């Protein structure tokens, strides 16, 4: 079968035997991270090796180690012991979170600045968050998170809006100490609820929405074989997921009448970064990866028929591994299903009298996970057209703050007494490139504006030029809306019928990068989303934009140190990183519960095939 | 009933009776434009005033006349006559279009082009296109239109693939005179066909693809009451039509509990342009204005079910008059209905234990155009969650030549010898501001970056700045997506019940705007595409941002000369001008039919109302 085939509750209870009977996984271990290897480059005749990758955490302090092991062997290949100290710390456990607000209960100086706002500390629920890297010398080395409180009036209040402000904490969660308490000031505790299942606030629910019926009589258009690989409408591919980056798709190609084509190999979203924008020392610290520090496929919800997937739906779940190796199955954690995408193309000639419309469509494939008070939806669609497409959507209960009587800058006020701190998320895309193959290059488009004048007199003449980035020291660039700036990854080795190389367009979206001064500990840490596009020489360990352990790690890994290498990009293996996100000044609108926003990009084909692949699409039945 | 109903065939009649009676409408007229004028500011308590305005062409030579009457009176309000060598010629009328071919079919100097060709005339279409103004001092107040031709195999030949490049000629259709014939040289005529429908070119059609059914089993959630109009889901507008402009929306507002509050008092696309970027004399010339010059109104499809409209669709048949003031319907000419828009909103929070989804929708309202060889759609959405976004749709076959040998640098190469020159497809949405009513202003919302340093020691702040447009001269606006630029429309005198204006967001795309030479004739005839956003002081007789008489008027009317009036619009009843289009290098995909392409922009509430406004919406049955 395939060695794209997702992992199999067999296969991580392999992986904890192996483990256990190579004594690296005894009672004081846990398992921070686990997930399949890719297959090396050019091995796939033949051989079965399903490799997995282990990052284990020592409860007990001692230095925690880098494994890898052959499920098919059943071998433990290596084992490398981390200093965290200099590369970075592992991901957060999910049994730490529930540790911050039950160590800070019993600490006398959190006890202290909760007397002093008369609050009550089972009321007060602690969101545990991330450290970072800051001005602190003691927690280099050490296994921190911050916490930040919220009152909870009843056990199904929400305490987002309460928001207890002026006062933070940090927590050793190996040690279980609290080692700082600030307590800047007191600030009244916002009373209004915001609870979107009150009748008291929603009022009486519409009736006038009527149902919205989407069926498929003759089931579905696509097929899935062996687990995980889709058919559908001449596009192949295999659906991968990992409980790092959520799903993350294969061996994407199109059948173009009897050649498969590939167009890209791997594609995922490598890292997020969620900046936020307010300088008070309660706040001034909060970033967040959470692909690289949380493990958004850990968190990943199940989606439900009718509700969070609608229409004819089939389903994924796939296995991770818990905190001790056990198999985890995540029910209906991956929605697919083709969806009606209007009209395709559609001519009628006054000459020929013929009238001629076809309609759309798009295959998707989508995930949801919900970090604390955040929500994200992660859309990948494909059209009949070859185009490809990702889309974020962002939803949730915005991150809250005490709205100060003199006004801020950083923050908006939702609610009376009530702010929400201004901040970004961001997205670095990560697409292993194979356009018709490995032997590829990207070139910078730019629109040319021309001046009236001799060959031009009507000053009507506009042009377009093309850039080829030939190495890696090269390869960062910039959006530019203004002169409609794209980038086309093409393959010099294979060309269409007209002589001209075989390409692919990507469309940006063209938002604002990373907002931070460029000294500041986010931007070296986040380096990769103060541009807008890198491209890499491809290479096995380079997986990550950001490295590989992000957690409390010190600037400067992952894109800016490959980019170092300088190395050649030109009709090459190589590897596209494009960062996107949204500017979220939060609005009175997001507030109980915010709506949805998007962000995202797209591949369109530019001469990759013949003539328009479409075709040979019927008409509507 | 209401003032903003459709005109009806009788309306038509009666203007047509009207005309006549009054000595307008005799033999050797035709009506180039009829169309109702919406009620002037605050009259609408009481009486109906029905009144339509006409452009009424002379056949046989004399002066034009600008008409408006009464249709509840029966009375000629006013007749001017117009000096069209001064203000412009009315649109292109129909019958003209078929004009240009036969008296070219006749001429000695265009037989001999041919000749030299060996092309059959009877196999020769000549595209009939809108003259422009250029150095050719015979045309001015003559009444023109030019040709390009194209060879037709057979009568079901898609005529496009086969351009008959190096020639041009130049025809007046009122006294039936070719002014000239130019021919730059012979290029060979491309061979290949074009016909996608032909099983040759298509091969097998797909047997894949199964169906999706999309119905609505209790009916849909709008209702639509005295013809046009609509209320569905707290929105309430009327569709209107006009031969001009299409599709317009009146009276767009939102319930927000038991007040009606007005967001957008007119919505139109007021004008479009198209400008091609070859600078050959056989094209330079090229420019058209598709609601200004030909009227997209006139040429709107019948949309048919299950192949342009997937669903349960209303359909809306307009009335328009043909050029002897007689009614025509245009059957099935606007499409509405609602769709599924996934997911809404969405939190799964851990400490209260409440998991909530809710789902979207969208109303759709849309129709297709056709103008030789270009089909666009115009689609309107309105979201549960107050957003407005308007998409064009941008397909039919490209407009080709031949593609030279030594290559090209503003033509792109679709098939062998077949060129498809660089172009753009630009729009002008006029919104007739009336968020809360018609006290408005405009402000610039930008993102601002901040340093490191004191009040900011971590170098993670940003904030936004908005900068009040006060009077029409600062009016005139650039996009800049590095800043994350947006401009906001809000009511001062207005608030919510946080003590801030309450205002709506508009989102441009950021497209390149009009790229010809400034000093160019297009710049100065589409002064309104240089610029992302304009702001008037509302006017009854400013509608068009090209001004009244389009077709072969010289530089500067319309919007740089509304502007220069500098009236105050800080706080007044204004009217917003957007900017944006396609700039369209074509792809050899783009061949032999176009994929559709989209553009558009969208508005969102920014403080409006005093929380989401969906929180009543309930969970999907
Ligand atoms: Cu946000
Ligand atoms: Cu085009
Ligand atoms: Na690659
Ligand atoms: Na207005």
Redesign the interface.
Same mark, same amino acid.
Not at 481 to 484: E, F, K, S, Y
């Given at each position: 079968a395939s060695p794209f085939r997702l992992a199999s509750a067999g296969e991580i209870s392999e992986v904890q035997g192996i483990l256990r009977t190579a004594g690296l996984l005894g009672p004081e271990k846990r398992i921070a991270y686990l997930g399949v290897l890719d297959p090396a480059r050019g091995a796939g005749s033949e051989a079965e090796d399903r490799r997995f990758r282990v990052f284990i955490h020592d409860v007990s302090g001692a230095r925690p180690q880098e494994v890898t092991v052959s499920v098919t062997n059943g071998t433990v290949i290596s084992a490398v012991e981390l200093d965290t100290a200099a590369t970075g710390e592992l991901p957060v456990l999910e049994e730490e979170f529930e540790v911050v607000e039950q160590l800070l209960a019993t600490d006398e100086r959190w006890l202290k600045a909760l007397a002093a706002r008369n609050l009550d500390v089972s009321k007060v629920?602690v969101a545990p968050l991330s450290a970072g890297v800051?001005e602190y010398a003691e927690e280099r080395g050490r296994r921190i998170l911050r916490g930040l409180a919220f009152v909870?009036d009843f056990?199904?209040?929400?305490?987002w809006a309460h928001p207890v402000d002026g006062l933070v904490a940090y927590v050793d969660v190996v040690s279980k100490e609290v080692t700082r308490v600030i307590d800047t000031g007191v600030f009244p505790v916002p009373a209004e609820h915001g609870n979107? /299942?009150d009748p008291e606030?929603? *009022?009486?629910?519409?009736t006038?929405? %009527?149902?919205?019926?989407?069926?498929?009589?003759? *089931?579905?258009?696509f097929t899935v074989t062996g687990g995980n690989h889709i058919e559908w409408?001449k596009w192949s591919l295999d659906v991968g997921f990992d409980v790092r980056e959520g799903v993350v798709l294969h061996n994407i190609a199109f059948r173009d009448g009897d050649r498969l084509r590939p167009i890209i190999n791997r594609a995922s979203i490598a890292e997020m970064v969620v #900046?936020?924008?307010? #300088?008070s020392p309660i706040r001034?610290?909060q970033?967040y990866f959470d692909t690289g520090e949380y493990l958004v496929g850990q968190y990943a919800?199940s989606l439900?028929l009718?509700?969070?997937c609608?229409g004819d739906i089939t389903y994924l779940s796939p296995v991770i591994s818990d905190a001790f190796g056990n198999p985890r199955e995540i029910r209906n954690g991956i929605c697919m299903h083709?969806?009606?995408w209007?009209?395709? =193309? %559609?001519?009628?000639?006054?000459?020929? *009298?013929?009238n001629?419309?076809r309609?759309?469509?798009r295959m998707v494939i989508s995930f949801?996970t /919900?970090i604390?008070?955040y929500?994200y939806?992660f859309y990948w669609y494909l059209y009949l057209?070859?185009t490809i497409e990702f889309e974020a %959507?962002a939803?949730?209960?915005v991150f809250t703050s005490a709205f100060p009587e003199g006004g801020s800058?950083?923050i908006s006020?939702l609610?009376?007494g009530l702010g929400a701190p201004?901040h970004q998320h961001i997205f670095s895309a990560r697409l292993d490139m194979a356009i018709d193959g490995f032997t590829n290059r990207v070139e910078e488009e730019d629109?040319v504006?021309? /001046?009236?004048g001799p060959?031009?007199?009507? *000053?009507? =003449?506009?042009?377009?030029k093309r850039t080829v980035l030939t190495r890696e020291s090269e390869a960062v660039r910039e959006?530019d =809306?203004?002169?409609?700036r794209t980038w086309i990854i093409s393959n010099p080795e294979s060309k269409?019928r007209?002589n001209?190389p075989v390409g692919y367009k990507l469309h940006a979206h063209?938002?604002?990068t990373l907002?931070?001064?460029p000294?500041?500990?986010?931007?070296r840490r986040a380096a990769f989303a103060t541009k807008d596009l890198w491209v890499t020489r491809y290479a096995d360990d380079e997986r990550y934009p950001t490295g590989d352990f992000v957690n409390q790690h010190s600037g400067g890994a992952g894109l800016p140190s490959y980019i170092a290498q300088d190395r050649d990009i030109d009709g090459q293996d190589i590897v596209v990183w494009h960062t996107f996100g949204l500017?979220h000044?939060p609005?009175?609108?997001?507030?109980?519960?915010?709506?949805?926003d998007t962000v995202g990009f797209k591949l369109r #084909?530019?001469?990759?095939?013949?003539?328009? #692949?479409?075709?040979?699409?019927?008409?509507?039945?």
């Open positions: 629920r800051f909870q056990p199904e209040d929400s305490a979107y /299942t606030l929603t *009022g009486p629910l519409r006038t929405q %009527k149902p919205i019926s989407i069926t498929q009589p003759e *089931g579905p258009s409408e #900046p936020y924008g307010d #300088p001034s610290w970033n919800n439900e009718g509700c969070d609608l083709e969806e009606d209007g009209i395709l =193309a %559609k001519h009628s000639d006054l000459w020929s *009298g013929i001629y419309t309609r759309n469509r949801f /919900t604390g008070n929500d939806g057209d070859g %959507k939803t949730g209960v800058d950083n006020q609610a009376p201004f629109v504006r021309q /001046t009236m060959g031009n007199e009507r *000053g009507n =003449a506009f042009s377009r959006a =809306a203004r002169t409609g269409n007209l001209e063209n938002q604002p907002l931070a001064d000294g500041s500990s986010i931007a500017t000044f609005r009175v609108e997001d507030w109980p519960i915010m709506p949805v #084909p530019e001469g990759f095939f013949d003539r328009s #692949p479409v075709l040979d699409v019927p008409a509507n039945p």
